[PDB]
Amino acid sequence: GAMDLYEMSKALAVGRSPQDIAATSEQFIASTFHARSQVLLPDDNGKLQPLTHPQGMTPWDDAIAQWSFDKGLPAGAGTDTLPGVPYQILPLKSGEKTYGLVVVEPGNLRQLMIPEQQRLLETFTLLVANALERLTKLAAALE
Amino acid sequence: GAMDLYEMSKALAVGRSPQDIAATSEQFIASTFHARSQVLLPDDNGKLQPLTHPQGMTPWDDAIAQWSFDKGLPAGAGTDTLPGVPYQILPLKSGEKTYGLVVVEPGNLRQLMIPEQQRLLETFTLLVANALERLTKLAAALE
C-alpha cells in the first residue's frame, strides 16, 4: 500500500537490535508483498544466519544465499542465477555495501514479479539496509 | 527518474559530513524534481542554518521554517500554513524525529504538486533523513 513504506520507516526507526530490524522487515514485507520472508544477517565470520528456514517457506540454497551476500547481487526469480526457484534472494544494500539478505517467497510469484512491485520492493530493501547500517556502525562505534 | 532514488542512495552512503549530505540532497532533488532546493540543519541550539537563501531561490520565512522543524510538519504549498507560497518546506524525518528541513522551489509548481511526484519526493526526504540520522548519531557516539 501507499503508506506502507512510511509506516515501516517509523517501525525501523525505533529498532534497537538487528533482530528487531529483521522482525519488523519480515512483518511489513509479508503484509505489503503478500509473501513469506526471512532476513539473513552475517555473523562474526561473514556467514549468514539463520541457516534454518522457517515453517511455511521452501528451503533455499544456503550457498547461493551466501553468494548473493558476498557479491551484493540478487539471485532467484528475476535473475540468471536460479531463475526457476519460487522465491527471490535480495541483498540489503546501502551504497556498495551489503548488510544482509532477504529471501522473499510470495503466494503468487507473477504478482510479486510485476515490475512496479519489484521497484517498490527495492525501496523497501533500501530502507531495511539503512537501518542495519545504522545499528552496525553504531555498535562498532561503542563496542 | 526511475533510477534516481537508487543513485542518490549510493551518493548518500558515502557522505562523511552533514554538508556532504546537504550538497548531495540538493543536487539530486534539483535534478529529479526540476527545482531549486536548500537543506537546513539545526545548530547547537536547535536553530536552523543557514539563515541566508541562495541566489535563485525566493526568500522563505525563517520562523515558519523553524516551526516546521520544531513540529515535524510541512509548511508551504500543499499545506494549510502558507498555502500560497511558491515553495514547499519539508521536514527531513526518520520516525518521529526531524533531523533537518528541505525547502523546495520548483520551476513549475503544478508539476511538483502532482500527487505521484509528492509521493516520490517523500521517499527522497526519508532517505536524506536516514543519512542525517546516521551521521548525527555516529558523531555523538564518538564525540
Interface touch A126/B6, C-beta < 8 Å:
yes
SS3 state of residue B76: strand
User: What backbone phi and psi angles, to 5 degrees, belong to A46?
Assistant: 85, 10
* Cell numbers placing A1: 500500500
Q: At what angle do helices B4-13 and A115-142 cross, to 10 degrees?
A: 10
Integer Cα distance of A40 and A51 in angstroms: 8
* Residue of B5, B7, B9, B90 to mutate, testing the A interface (most A Cβ within 10 Å of its Cβ): B9
List helix spans (H) across chain B: 4-13, 18-33, 62-71, 109-112, 115-142
CA angle B77, B82, B88 (to 5 degrees): 35
Contacts of A13 (CB under 8 A, 6+ apart): A131, B94, B95, B96, B97, B133
Distance from CA of B109 to the nearest CA of A (A): 23
Under 8 Å between Cβ of A41 and A18: yes
Residue of A nearest to B14 (CA): A95
SS3 state of residue B115: helix
Cα distances (Å, whole numbers) of residue A68 to B2, B41, B92: 24, 37, 32
Integer Cα distance of B26 and B41 in angstroms: 13
Contacts of B62 (CB under 8 A, 6+ apart): B48, B51
Q: Which helix (H) or strand (E) holds A133?
A: helix A115-142
From chain A, the residues in CB contact with B122 under 8 A are: 6
Under 8 Å between Cβ of B134 and A134: yes
Integer Cα distance of A130 and A143 in angstroms: 20
Detail the DSSP E strand segments found in A12-51: 35-42, 48-49
Domains and CATH numbers, chain A: 1-143 (3.30.450.40)
Integer Cα distance of A121 and A110 in angstroms: 14
From chain B, the residues in CB contact with A94 under 8 A are: 9, 13
Q: Nearest by CB to A14, from B95, B127, B137: name it.
A: B95
Integer Cα distance of B131 and B39 in angstroms: 13
User: Does the beta carbon of B139 lie under 8 angstroms from any beta carbon of chain A?
Assistant: no
Cα diameter, chain B = 45
Sequence-separated contacts (24+) of B69-72 with Cβ below 8 Å: B69/B40, B69/B42, B69/B98, B69/B100, B69/B101, B70/B46, B72/B96, B72/B97, B72/B98
Contacts of B140 (CB under 8 A, 6+ apart): none
- Which of B4, B11, B7 is CA-nearest to residue B35? B4
Q: Decide the pairing of beta strands A97-106 and A35-42.
A: antiparallel
Residue whose C-alpha cell reads 513504506 in the numeric block:
A5
Task: Count residue pairs from A and B with Cβ separation < 8 A.
Answer: 58
Residues listed for chain A = 143
Under 8 Å between Cβ of B77 and B83: yes
